[PDB]
């Protein structure tokens, strides 16, 4: 059986994409605390200076 | 008439393959990383956990004889316990 | 092959009026691959949703992959009002009776729950026990990896964190945390425990700790995970983060007033303070400084009430007082609790007799002359 070299490309490449996608999607969905929260920090700095002219 | 033909594992099947491979008894695992000490062989912390249960078993087999209790045998090759069951054993 | 701006409505009208559903699926899949790296093309999405989920296998999950990506892209394209009628429409598709397509549906839910304001709108209409139904035994090898990522996505908001406390999902995930099979769900559930604990602005962090972190095999399971040498530095840092917080709260759960709150209010629950060696060693004379009959108030609860589980905590706490104070044996002989512990040793309960055997043997360990 010569399919052992194909079985390497069959399913060991599947272990490549699961660590490619589902580890970067954990990083890509971390914008709820690294993009939304960090936006919530600087809007207080804009509301610190709007509560003098108002 | 042997061959050093390679065999691949995937570390989710590193226990249950090898254990049923060790439930057959035809395999001659050869160490090909000799440039390393007796520690840092990827599992030194957990083989001491088996050794700590080994130390507890060699101690409890001594005190079971000083009270002179008969020992059940029921001699059979059992099922090898999984690492899922391992943490439940030390309890 | 770039610069595609027009002809979007021409592809949309051809997609609806196509009797060849397999060719319409090829029209849909080519639209999905094109929109995988492109911008927005939701009134048409309100029109494409009704023709979708209609008697087709591959076109159902692909349109779901398309419409959620249409929901996950575009600021003005945020259509959470229309997505409320769409999430409940796919909630029957989110039932756990199908096969070979729920994994793509969970991945479609992973993009759908990635939003912030849509997630709080979702969880009110969700009925999140269905996600706990996926946490129930249905062979979740990669399905629980999508499910725990959904729980980690909902653990961002503190207002959603308080609404998430109306379930036992913290201990229902500790059983899944005790699995530790694919070595990636262990990374997801560890940071989700860090997300639920740290990102909650209340005094209910201990309420989320006493549920699963304290009164389950979580702090003990995290001890062996710290002994493990996984290469992921994010999981290695979250392991030290959860150990420092839960190790502080377990120390904070033993302050001898919380033990007094357990004693005076009663019900004598088995807590970590009753088994902690630091709690019995530090609060040794705390019983004697509190008008010592308060220690006999633990004995009065042990003598009068039967309590086949609650008196077991009364037996071990009485022996720890005798072990940390030999003069309390004279105080126990003054209250006569030794004859009460001796009579309670003959109880029919197994754990009550085993706890009373360790206590009564500790009561006569010092042996002053009579």
Coordinates of C-alpha atoms in Angstrom, one line a residue:
Chain A
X1 CA 0.0 0.0 0.0
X2 CA 1.5 3.3 -1.2
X3 CA -1.3 5.4 0.3
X4 CA 0.7 6.0 3.5
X5 CA 2.3 9.1 1.9
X6 CA -1.2 10.1 0.9
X7 CA -2.6 9.4 4.4
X8 CA 0.0 11.9 5.6
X9 CA -1.4 14.6 3.2
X10 CA -4.9 13.3 4.0
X11 CA -5.2 13.9 7.8
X12 CA -1.9 15.3 9.1
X13 CA -2.7 18.4 7.1
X14 CA -6.0 18.5 8.9
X15 CA -4.1 19.0 12.2
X16 CA -2.4 22.0 10.5
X17 CA -5.6 23.9 9.7
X18 CA -7.3 23.2 13.1
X19 CA -4.3 24.9 14.8
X20 CA -4.3 27.5 12.1
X21 CA -8.0 28.4 12.4
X22 CA -9.2 27.6 15.9
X23 CA -6.2 29.2 17.6
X24 CA -6.3 32.3 15.5
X25 CA -10.1 32.5 15.9
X26 CA -9.5 32.6 19.6
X27 CA -7.1 35.5 18.9
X28 CA -9.5 37.1 16.4
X29 CA -12.4 36.9 18.8
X30 CA -10.3 38.6 21.5
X31 CA -11.4 42.0 20.2
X32 CA -14.2 42.1 22.8
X33 CA -11.5 42.8 25.4
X34 CA -8.7 44.2 23.3
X35 CA -10.6 46.5 20.9
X36 CA -14.0 47.2 22.6
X37 CA -12.5 47.6 26.1
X38 CA -9.5 49.7 24.9
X39 CA -12.0 51.9 23.0
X40 CA -13.9 52.2 26.3
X41 CA -10.8 53.6 28.0
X42 CA -10.2 56.5 25.6
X43 CA -13.8 57.7 25.4
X44 CA -13.6 58.5 29.1
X45 CA -10.7 60.8 28.2
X46 CA -13.0 62.5 25.7
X47 CA -15.7 62.7 28.3
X48 CA -13.2 64.1 30.8
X49 CA -12.7 67.2 28.6
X50 CA -16.3 67.5 27.4
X51 CA -17.4 68.0 31.0
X52 CA -16.0 71.5 31.0
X53 CA -17.4 73.0 27.9
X54 CA -20.8 71.5 28.4
Chain B
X1 CA 14.4 -10.1 9.6
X2 CA 13.5 -6.8 11.3
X3 CA 12.9 -3.3 10.0
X4 CA 13.4 0.1 11.7
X5 CA 10.3 1.3 9.8
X6 CA 8.9 4.5 11.2
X7 CA 5.6 4.9 13.0
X8 CA 3.8 8.2 13.6
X9 CA 1.6 9.3 16.6
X10 CA -0.6 12.3 17.2
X11 CA -0.5 12.8 21.0
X12 CA -4.3 12.4 21.3
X13 CA -3.5 8.8 20.4
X14 CA -0.3 8.5 22.3
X15 CA -1.7 6.5 25.3
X16 CA -4.5 4.3 23.9
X17 CA -2.6 3.3 20.8
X18 CA 0.6 2.4 22.6
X19 CA -1.3 0.6 25.4
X20 CA -3.1 -1.6 23.0
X21 CA 0.3 -1.8 21.1
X22 CA 1.7 -2.9 24.5
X23 CA -1.3 -5.2 24.8
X24 CA 0.2 -7.2 21.9
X25 CA 3.9 -7.5 22.6
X26 CA 5.7 -7.5 19.3
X27 CA 7.4 -4.0 19.4
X28 CA 11.0 -2.9 20.0
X29 CA 10.8 0.9 20.7
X30 CA 14.3 2.3 20.1
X31 CA 15.5 5.6 21.7
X32 CA 16.9 7.9 19.0
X33 CA 17.5 10.9 21.2
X34 CA 20.5 9.8 23.3
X35 CA 21.8 13.4 23.8
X36 CA 19.5 14.1 26.7
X37 CA 19.6 13.5 30.5
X38 CA 17.4 11.1 32.5
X39 CA 15.0 14.0 33.3
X40 CA 13.2 16.2 30.7
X41 CA 11.9 13.2 28.8
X42 CA 8.5 15.0 28.3
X43 CA 6.8 13.0 31.1
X44 CA 9.1 13.1 34.2
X45 CA 6.5 14.8 36.3
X46 CA 3.9 12.1 35.6
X47 CA 6.1 9.0 35.8
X48 CA 6.9 10.1 39.3
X49 CA 3.2 10.3 39.9
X50 CA 3.1 6.6 38.9
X51 CA 6.2 6.1 41.0
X52 CA 4.5 7.9 44.0
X53 CA 1.6 5.4 43.6
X54 CA 4.2 2.7 43.3
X55 CA 5.8 3.9 46.5
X56 CA 2.4 3.8 48.1
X57 CA 1.7 0.3 46.7
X58 CA 5.0 -1.1 47.9
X59 CA 4.3 0.4 51.3
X60 CA 0.7 -0.8 51.5
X61 CA 1.7 -4.3 50.5
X62 CA 4.0 -4.4 53.5
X63 CA 1.4 -3.4 56.1
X64 CA -1.2 -5.7 54.7
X65 CA 1.0 -8.6 55.7
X66 CA 1.8 -7.4 59.2
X67 CA -1.9 -7.6 60.1
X68 CA -1.8 -11.0 58.3
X69 CA -4.8 -10.5 55.9
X70 CA -5.5 -13.0 53.1
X71 CA -5.0 -11.6 49.6
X72 CA -7.4 -11.9 46.7
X73 CA -5.7 -12.7 43.4
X74 CA -8.3 -13.3 40.6
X75 CA -5.4 -13.6 38.2
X76 CA -6.2 -11.9 34.8
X77 CA -4.6 -9.3 32.6
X78 CA -6.8 -6.2 33.2
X79 CA -7.6 -3.1 31.3
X80 CA -4.9 -0.4 31.5
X81 CA -6.2 2.7 33.2
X82 CA -6.5 5.9 31.2
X83 CA -5.0 9.2 32.2
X84 CA -8.6 10.3 32.6
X85 CA -8.9 7.7 35.4
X86 CA -5.4 8.5 36.7
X87 CA -6.3 11.7 38.6
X88 CA -9.3 9.8 40.1
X89 CA -6.9 7.1 41.4
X90 CA -4.7 9.4 43.5
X91 CA -7.9 10.5 45.3
Chain C
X1 CA -10.0 39.8 -11.3
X2 CA -10.5 42.5 -8.6
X3 CA -12.7 45.7 -8.6
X4 CA -16.2 44.3 -8.3
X5 CA -18.7 47.0 -7.4
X6 CA -21.8 46.6 -9.6
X7 CA -23.8 43.5 -10.6
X8 CA -24.6 42.6 -7.0
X9 CA -28.4 42.8 -7.5
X10 CA -28.1 40.9 -10.8
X11 CA -26.5 38.0 -8.9
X12 CA -29.1 38.3 -6.2
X13 CA -32.1 38.1 -8.6
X14 CA -30.5 35.1 -10.4
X15 CA -30.0 33.3 -7.1
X16 CA -33.7 33.5 -6.2
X17 CA -35.1 32.6 -9.7
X18 CA -33.0 29.4 -10.3
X19 CA -34.8 26.1 -10.4
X20 CA -31.5 24.2 -10.5
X21 CA -30.8 24.2 -6.8
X22 CA -27.4 22.4 -7.3
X23 CA -26.4 25.2 -9.7
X24 CA -27.8 27.7 -7.2
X25 CA -25.7 26.0 -4.6
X26 CA -22.7 26.5 -6.8
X27 CA -23.8 30.1 -7.3
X28 CA -24.0 30.5 -3.5
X29 CA -20.7 28.7 -2.7
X30 CA -18.9 30.9 -5.2
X31 CA -20.5 33.9 -3.6
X32 CA -19.3 32.6 -0.2
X33 CA -15.7 32.2 -1.3
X34 CA -15.7 35.7 -2.9
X35 CA -17.2 37.3 0.3
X36 CA -14.8 35.4 2.5
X37 CA -12.1 38.1 1.9
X38 CA -14.3 41.0 0.5
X39 CA -16.5 43.7 2.0
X40 CA -20.3 44.1 2.4
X41 CA -22.5 43.7 -0.7
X42 CA -29.6 44.0 5.1
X43 CA -32.8 44.3 3.1
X44 CA -31.3 41.9 0.5
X45 CA -30.2 39.7 3.5
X46 CA -33.8 39.9 4.7
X47 CA -34.8 38.7 1.2
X48 CA -32.0 36.0 1.0
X49 CA -33.0 34.5 4.4
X50 CA -36.5 33.5 3.3
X51 CA -35.4 31.6 0.3
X52 CA -32.7 30.0 2.4
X53 CA -33.3 27.0 4.7
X54 CA -35.7 25.5 2.2
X55 CA -35.3 21.7 1.5
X56 CA -31.6 21.9 0.6
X57 CA -28.7 20.3 2.5
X58 CA -25.6 22.2 1.3
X59 CA -27.4 25.4 0.6
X60 CA -28.7 25.7 4.2
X61 CA -25.3 25.7 6.0
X62 CA -23.7 27.8 3.2
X63 CA -26.3 30.6 3.4
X64 CA -26.0 30.4 7.2
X65 CA -22.3 30.8 6.7
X66 CA -23.0 33.7 4.3
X67 CA -25.7 35.5 6.4
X68 CA -23.7 35.3 9.6
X69 CA -20.6 36.7 7.8
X70 CA -22.9 39.4 6.5
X71 CA -23.9 40.0 10.1
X72 CA -20.3 39.9 11.2
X73 CA -19.3 42.6 8.7
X74 CA -20.4 46.2 8.2
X75 CA -21.2 48.8 10.8
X76 CA -24.3 50.1 9.1
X77 CA -25.0 46.4 8.1
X78 CA -25.6 45.6 11.8
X79 CA -29.1 44.2 11.6
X80 CA -29.7 42.8 15.1
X81 CA -33.3 43.7 14.9
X82 CA -33.8 41.5 11.9
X83 CA -31.3 39.0 13.3
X84 CA -33.6 38.5 16.3
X85 CA -36.2 36.9 13.9
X86 CA -33.3 35.0 12.3
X87 CA -31.6 33.6 15.4
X88 CA -34.9 32.1 16.5
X89 CA -35.4 30.8 13.0
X90 CA -32.1 29.0 13.1
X91 CA -32.7 27.9 16.7
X92 CA -34.8 25.0 15.5
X93 CA -31.8 24.3 13.2
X94 CA -29.7 24.6 16.4
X95 CA -31.4 21.6 17.9
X96 CA -29.2 18.6 18.7
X97 CA -31.1 16.0 16.7
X98 CA -29.3 16.6 13.3
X99 CA -26.1 15.0 12.0
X100 CA -23.0 16.1 10.1
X101 CA -24.1 19.7 9.8
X102 CA -24.4 21.0 13.4
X103 CA -20.7 21.5 13.5
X104 CA -20.9 24.1 10.7
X105 CA -24.0 25.5 12.5
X106 CA -22.0 25.8 15.7
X107 CA -19.2 27.5 13.7
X108 CA -21.9 29.8 12.2
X109 CA -23.0 30.4 15.8
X110 CA -19.3 31.1 16.7
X111 CA -19.3 34.0 14.2
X112 CA -22.8 35.1 15.3
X113 CA -22.0 35.2 19.0
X114 CA -18.8 37.1 18.2
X115 CA -20.8 40.4 18.3
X116 CA -21.2 42.4 21.5
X117 CA -24.7 44.0 21.4
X118 CA -26.2 41.1 19.4
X119 CA -24.9 38.6 22.1
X120 CA -26.9 40.3 24.9
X121 CA -29.9 40.3 22.5
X122 CA -29.2 36.6 21.8
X123 CA -28.9 35.3 25.4
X124 CA -32.3 36.7 26.4
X125 CA -33.9 34.8 23.4
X126 CA -31.4 31.9 23.5
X127 CA -32.4 29.5 26.2
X128 CA -28.8 28.6 26.8
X129 CA -29.6 25.2 28.2
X130 CA -29.6 24.0 24.6
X131 CA -25.8 24.9 24.7
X132 CA -25.8 23.0 28.0
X133 CA -27.6 20.3 26.1
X134 CA -24.6 20.2 23.8
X135 CA -22.6 20.0 27.1
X136 CA -24.7 17.0 27.9
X137 CA -23.4 13.7 26.5
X138 CA -23.6 13.8 22.7
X139 CA -20.0 13.1 21.9
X140 CA -18.6 16.6 21.8
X141 CA -15.1 16.1 20.6
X142 CA -14.9 19.2 18.4
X143 CA -18.5 20.2 19.2
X144 CA -17.6 21.2 22.8
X145 CA -14.6 23.1 21.4
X146 CA -17.1 25.2 19.5
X147 CA -19.4 25.2 22.5
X148 CA -16.8 26.3 25.1
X149 CA -15.7 29.0 22.6
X150 CA -19.3 30.2 22.6
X151 CA -19.3 30.3 26.4
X152 CA -15.9 32.2 26.3
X153 CA -17.5 34.7 23.8
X154 CA -20.5 35.3 26.1
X155 CA -18.2 35.8 29.2
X156 CA -16.9 39.2 27.9
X157 CA -19.7 41.4 29.2
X158 CA -20.1 41.8 33.0
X159 CA -23.9 42.4 32.5
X160 CA -24.1 39.2 30.6
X161 CA -21.9 37.6 33.3
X162 CA -24.5 38.3 36.0
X163 CA -27.3 36.8 33.8
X164 CA -25.1 33.7 33.2
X165 CA -25.1 32.9 36.9
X166 CA -28.6 31.5 36.7
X167 CA -27.3 28.0 35.9
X168 CA -24.9 25.3 37.0
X169 CA -22.9 25.7 33.8
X170 CA -19.7 26.5 35.8
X171 CA -19.8 23.0 37.4
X172 CA -21.2 21.5 34.2
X173 CA -18.0 22.7 32.5
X174 CA -15.8 21.4 35.3
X175 CA -16.9 17.9 34.3
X176 CA -15.9 18.8 30.7
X177 CA -12.7 20.3 32.3
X178 CA -12.1 16.9 33.8
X179 CA -12.1 15.3 30.3
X180 CA -8.8 16.8 29.0
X181 CA -8.7 14.8 25.8
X182 CA -7.9 16.9 22.7
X183 CA -5.6 19.3 24.7
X184 CA -7.3 22.3 23.1
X185 CA -10.6 22.3 24.9
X186 CA -8.6 22.4 28.1
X187 CA -7.0 25.6 26.8
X188 CA -10.4 27.1 25.9
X189 CA -12.2 26.1 29.2
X190 CA -9.3 27.4 31.3
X191 CA -9.4 30.9 29.9
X192 CA -13.2 30.8 30.0
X193 CA -12.9 30.2 33.7
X194 CA -10.5 33.2 33.8
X195 CA -13.0 35.2 31.8
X196 CA -15.9 34.4 34.1
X197 CA -13.9 35.1 37.2
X198 CA -12.0 38.2 36.4
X199 CA -14.5 40.0 34.1
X200 CA -17.3 40.2 36.7
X201 CA -17.8 43.5 38.6
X202 CA -19.6 42.2 41.7
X203 CA -19.2 40.4 45.0
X204 CA -20.6 37.3 43.2
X205 CA -17.0 36.3 42.1
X206 CA -16.9 34.2 45.2
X207 CA -20.4 32.9 44.2
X208 CA -18.8 31.8 41.0
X209 CA -15.9 30.4 42.9
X210 CA -17.7 28.4 45.7
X211 CA -19.9 26.8 43.0
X212 CA -17.2 25.3 40.8
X213 CA -13.7 26.6 41.7
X214 CA -13.9 25.8 45.4
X215 CA -16.5 23.0 45.9
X216 CA -15.4 20.8 43.0
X217 CA -12.3 19.2 41.6
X218 CA -11.1 22.4 39.9
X219 CA -8.3 23.7 42.1
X220 CA -6.9 20.2 42.5
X221 CA -7.2 19.6 38.7
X222 CA -5.4 22.9 38.1
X223 CA -2.5 21.8 40.3
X224 CA -1.6 18.9 37.9
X225 CA -2.1 21.3 34.9
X226 CA 0.5 23.6 36.4
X227 CA 2.7 20.5 36.8
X228 CA 2.1 19.9 33.1
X229 CA 4.5 21.5 30.6
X230 CA 2.4 22.5 27.7
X231 CA 4.0 24.9 25.2
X232 CA 1.1 27.4 25.1
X233 CA 2.2 30.4 27.1
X234 CA -1.4 31.8 27.1
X235 CA -2.7 28.7 28.8
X236 CA 0.4 28.6 31.1
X237 CA -0.3 32.2 32.2
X238 CA -4.0 31.5 32.7
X239 CA -3.2 28.5 34.9
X240 CA -1.2 30.8 37.2
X241 CA -3.9 33.4 37.0
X242 CA -6.7 31.1 38.1
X243 CA -4.5 29.6 40.8
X244 CA -3.7 32.9 42.4
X245 CA -7.3 34.1 42.4
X246 CA -8.9 30.8 43.7
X247 CA -6.0 30.3 46.2
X248 CA -6.8 33.8 47.6
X249 CA -10.6 33.2 47.8
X250 CA -10.1 29.9 49.5
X251 CA -7.9 31.7 52.0
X252 CA -10.5 34.4 52.2
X253 CA -13.3 31.8 52.9
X254 CA -11.5 31.0 56.2
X255 CA -11.5 34.1 58.4
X256 CA -13.3 32.6 61.5
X257 CA -16.2 34.9 61.0
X258 CA -17.4 33.1 58.0
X259 CA -17.0 30.0 60.1
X260 CA -19.0 31.9 62.8
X261 CA -21.5 32.8 60.1
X262 CA -21.8 29.0 59.3
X263 CA -22.0 28.3 63.0
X264 CA -24.5 30.9 64.2
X265 CA -26.9 30.7 61.2
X266 CA -26.4 26.9 61.2
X267 CA -26.9 24.2 58.6
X268 CA -23.2 23.2 59.0
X269 CA -22.2 22.8 55.3
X270 CA -19.0 21.0 54.4
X271 CA -16.8 24.0 53.3
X272 CA -13.1 24.3 52.5
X273 CA -12.5 26.1 55.8
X274 CA -13.4 23.0 57.8
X275 CA -10.8 21.0 56.0
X276 CA -8.1 23.7 55.8
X277 CA -5.2 23.3 58.2
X278 CA -4.6 27.1 58.2
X279 CA -8.1 27.7 59.4
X280 CA -7.8 25.4 62.4
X281 CA -4.3 26.5 63.3
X282 CA -4.9 30.3 63.2
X283 CA -8.4 30.3 64.8
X284 CA -7.3 28.1 67.7
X285 CA -8.2 30.5 70.5
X286 CA -11.0 32.1 68.5
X287 CA -13.5 29.7 70.1
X288 CA -12.2 30.6 73.6
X289 CA -12.1 34.4 72.9
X290 CA -15.8 34.3 71.9
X291 CA -17.2 33.4 75.3
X292 CA -16.3 29.7 75.1
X293 CA -19.9 28.5 75.2
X294 CA -19.9 29.6 71.5
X295 CA -17.7 26.5 70.9
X296 CA -20.3 24.6 73.0
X297 CA -22.9 26.1 70.6
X298 CA -21.3 23.9 68.0
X299 CA -21.6 21.1 70.5
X300 CA -25.2 22.0 71.3
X301 CA -26.0 21.8 67.6
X302 CA -24.1 18.4 67.5
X303 CA -25.8 17.0 70.6
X304 CA -29.4 18.0 70.1
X305 CA -29.8 17.7 66.3
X306 CA -29.3 14.4 64.5
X307 CA -28.1 15.9 61.1
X308 CA -26.6 12.8 59.3
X309 CA -24.5 15.1 57.0
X310 CA -24.2 18.3 59.1
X311 CA -23.0 16.7 62.3
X312 CA -20.1 15.2 60.3
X313 CA -18.8 18.7 60.0
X314 CA -19.5 19.1 63.7
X315 CA -17.3 16.1 64.5
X316 CA -14.3 17.1 62.5
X317 CA -14.4 20.8 63.7
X318 CA -14.5 19.6 67.3
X319 CA -11.5 17.4 66.9
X320 CA -9.5 20.2 65.2
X321 CA -10.3 22.4 68.2
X322 CA -8.9 19.7 70.5
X323 CA -5.9 19.2 68.3
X324 CA -5.1 22.9 68.3
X325 CA -5.9 23.4 71.9
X326 CA -5.2 20.8 74.6
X327 CA -6.9 22.9 77.2
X328 CA -10.1 22.7 75.2
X329 CA -10.3 19.0 76.2
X330 CA -11.1 20.2 79.7
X331 CA -13.6 22.6 78.1
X332 CA -15.1 19.7 76.2
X333 CA -15.2 17.7 79.4
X334 CA -16.9 20.7 81.1
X335 CA -19.6 20.7 78.4
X336 CA -19.7 16.9 78.3
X337 CA -19.3 16.6 74.6
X338 CA -17.1 13.6 74.9
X339 CA -20.0 11.4 76.0
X340 CA -22.1 13.0 73.2
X341 CA -19.4 12.2 70.6
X342 CA -19.1 8.6 72.0
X343 CA -22.9 8.1 71.7
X344 CA -22.8 9.6 68.2
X345 CA -20.0 7.2 67.2
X346 CA -22.6 4.4 67.3
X347 CA -24.7 6.2 64.7
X348 CA -25.9 4.1 61.7
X349 CA -24.4 6.6 59.2
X350 CA -21.0 5.5 57.8
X351 CA -19.4 9.0 57.3
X352 CA -20.8 10.2 60.7
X353 CA -19.3 7.2 62.5
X354 CA -16.0 7.6 60.6
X355 CA -15.7 11.3 61.5
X356 CA -16.7 10.6 65.1
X357 CA -14.0 7.9 65.4
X358 CA -11.3 10.3 64.3
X359 CA -12.7 12.9 66.7
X360 CA -13.1 10.7 69.8
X361 CA -9.6 9.3 69.3
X362 CA -8.2 12.8 69.1
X363 CA -10.2 13.7 72.2
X364 CA -8.1 11.3 74.4
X365 CA -4.8 11.8 72.6
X366 CA -3.3 14.0 75.3
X367 CA -4.4 12.0 78.3
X368 CA -4.1 14.3 81.4
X369 CA -4.5 12.6 84.8
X370 CA -8.0 12.3 86.0

